[PDB]
Ligand binder design. Structure first.
Ligand SMILES: [Ca+2]
Ligand SMILES: [Cl-]
Length: 127
């Protein structure tokens, strides 16, 4: 399950441009499958300024945990508070209700450092 329109990181995040011009970030179907049943998501602080590649959230399952990185630089403008209660949304709806945070990008040329869907599919086959 690799939505054809998203951009992806090598750390298994996806990035979606929204109608308000901000970007939504979550983890992929593959990511949630690797982690298994979700227990806790540590969300970033709204208002925080991050550089592309900064660690800004953590996903923890019954068995494992991974850092989650800003795919682009910018300002965190929203976080999915639903995950505090229902982190399992990351398992059931990784591209939808399980989104993690939203960023107002400071340099959109950074999109060029992300993978397109076909590259992410290739990455999965090499893992
Ligand atoms: Ca936090
Ligand atoms: Cl989904």
């Amino acid at each position: 399950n690799v939505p054809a329109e998203l951009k992806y990181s090598k750390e298994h995040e996806w990035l979606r441009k929204e109608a308000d011009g901000t970007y939504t970030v979550g983890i992929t179907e593959h990511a949630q499958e690797l982690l298994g049943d979700m227990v806790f998501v540590d969300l970033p602080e709204v208002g925080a300024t991050v550089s592309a590649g900064d660690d800004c959230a953590v996903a923890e399952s019954v068995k494992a945990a991974s850092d989650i990185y800003a795919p682009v630089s910018g300002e965190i403008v929203a976080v999915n508070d639903a995950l505090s209660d229902s982190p399992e949304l990351v398992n059931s709806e990784p591209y939808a209700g399980g989104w993690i945070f939203k960023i107002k990008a400071s340099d959109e040329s950074e999109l060029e450092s992300l993978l397109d869907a076909t590259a992410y599919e290739a990455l999965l086959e090499d893992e």
